[PDB]
């Protein structure tokens, strides 16, 4: 804290409490007894534990029929309107599209759709699977999952 | 994540001051003094929940003793007669009867006298 | 020389009970001009006992 | 509001030994 180490007043004779510095934490305008510092909150998770949780999550999605497997999922042109129509007739509004190969055409179509996400099998995280109401996996996307999950 | 304690602190102080309502001077206005007053009132209330039972017991005995003597018998003799006569009326009813129903009490003392004799 | 406990507002008011002022409630009316004035005092315009005394 | 500056010795120099 900006200031000086000079004692505000003498140790004895003054009728008020002993003080040592203007920057003491019990003083106005300067203090904070335990000041925070920039810290890393990331924690270690074992590889097997990460895989086990991912396997556990996928199984339960299948059990709650929240996971739908279909053939290749693609859009002819990079238009959000087309993607909205394709998801409308399927009665899906909050979906996570997982495809084996990432194509810019599908990536751009879903960019402006908040409730819709497009992802690759490699870039799969537990939070996304849990958060999204429905998960749609392509045939290719499914295959890569077992290979990486093993 | 700084936390401000203005809202919570004001709620706690209001609760204590509300319980200190009716006290004299700073005991109903100042929290530091009101808290002590409220705590002391709590101790007294706990203590007097037990003194009340004995205080009323003394009052009933005094009433019975006055009524029994008016009928011509001491309290200790009168109670002994009831125990001998197998009467389970307690002091609260006995004092109540003496105040209101004089005839009923006269029957009781008569019953007690017979049992003693 | 100095207090050991601060007197209450009750004691403060009790001491101040004797500080109340008293109204004159004794305003006399001039014989001629009929102007209210303090007894045994000249009126504002300069009358006393009827006859003008200031002439100013 | 503001601490004094002169801060004279208030105690009286009279030791009761």
């Amino acid at each position: 804290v900006t200031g000086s180490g000079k004692k505000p007043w003498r140790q004895k004779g003054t009728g008020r409490a002993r003080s040592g510095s203007i920057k003491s934490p019990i003083w106005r305008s300067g203090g904070v007894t335990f000041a925070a510092r920039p810290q890393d909150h990331s924690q270690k998770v074992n590889k097997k534990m990460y895989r086990g949780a991912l396997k556990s999550i996928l199984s339960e999605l299948v059990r709650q029929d929240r996971l739908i497997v279909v053939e290749k999922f693609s859009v002819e042109a990079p238009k959000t309107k087309l993607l909205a129509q394709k998801l409308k007739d399927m009665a899906l509004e909050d979906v996570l599209i997982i495809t084996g190969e990432l194509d810019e055409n599908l990536f751009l179509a879903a960019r402006n759709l908040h409730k819709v996400d497009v992802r690759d099998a490699t870039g799969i995280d537990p939070v996304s699977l849990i958060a999204f109401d429905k998960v749609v996996m392509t045939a290719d996307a499914v295959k890569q999952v077992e290979e990486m999950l093993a | 994540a700084r936390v401000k304690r203005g809202v919570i602190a004001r709620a706690r102080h209001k609760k204590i001051l509300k319980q200190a309502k009716g006290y004299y001077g700073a005991r109903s206005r100042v929290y530091r003094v009101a808290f002590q007053a409220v705590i002391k009132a709590g101790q007294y209330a706990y203590r007097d929940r037990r003194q009340r039972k004995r205080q009323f017991r003394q009052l009933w005995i005094a009433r019975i003793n006055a009524a029994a003597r008016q009928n011509g018998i001491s309290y200790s003799k009168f109670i002994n007669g009831l125990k001998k006569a197998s009467v389970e009326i307690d002091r609260k009813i006995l004092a109540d009867i003496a105040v209101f129903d004089k005839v009923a009490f006269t029957a009781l003392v008569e019953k007690a006298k017979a049992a003693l004799a | 020389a100095v207090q050991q406990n601060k007197p209450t507002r009750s004691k403060r008011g009790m001491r101040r009970s004797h500080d109340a002022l008293t109204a004159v409630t004794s305003l006399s009316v001039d014989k001629t001009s009929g102007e209210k004035h303090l007894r045994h005092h000249i009126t504002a315009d300069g009358y006393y006992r009827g006859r003008k005394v200031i002439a100013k | 509001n503001n601490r004094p500056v002169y801060i004279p010795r208030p105690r009286p120099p009279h030791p009761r030994l």
Binding site: - | - | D19, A20, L21, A23, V24, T25, L27, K36, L38 | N1, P4, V5, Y6, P8
Partner: protein
């Protein structure tokens, strides 16, 4: 009617003015006016001016016939205080409070 009239930030202390206020509380305006006229206090002329204003407000903005008016309510409240530094002996300093007050007078015909 209400016809309130107040004078805010009077230099006189609330305590000192409050003695004058108690004199005329509940009295008719006619008796209140000459009571203040012959009261030897600075607060007397402050309160009298407020009372004159209240009567004028009633006469102009409200019904006439100010003869039957009474000072139903009159109270003095402490106002903002000005802090001043006054040197004392041995280099010490002390705070002088120039206390003000609000004088409120309410008159009504009923």
């Amino acid at each position: 009617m209400e016809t309130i009239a107040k004078h805010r930030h009077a230099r006189s202390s609330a305590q000192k003015v409050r003695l004058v206020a108690d004199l005329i509380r509940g009295k008719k305006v006619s008796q209140a006016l000459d009571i203040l006229t012959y009261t030897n206090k600075k607060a007397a002329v402050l309160v009298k001016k407020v009372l004159e204003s209240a009567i004028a407000n009633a006469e102009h903005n409200d019904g006439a016939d100010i003869d039957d008016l009474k000072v139903t309510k009159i109270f003095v409240d402490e106002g903002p205080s000005m802090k001043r530094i006054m040197p004392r002996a041995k280099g010490r300093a002390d705070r002088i409070l120039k206390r003000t007050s609000h004088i409120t007078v309410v008159v009504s015909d009923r």
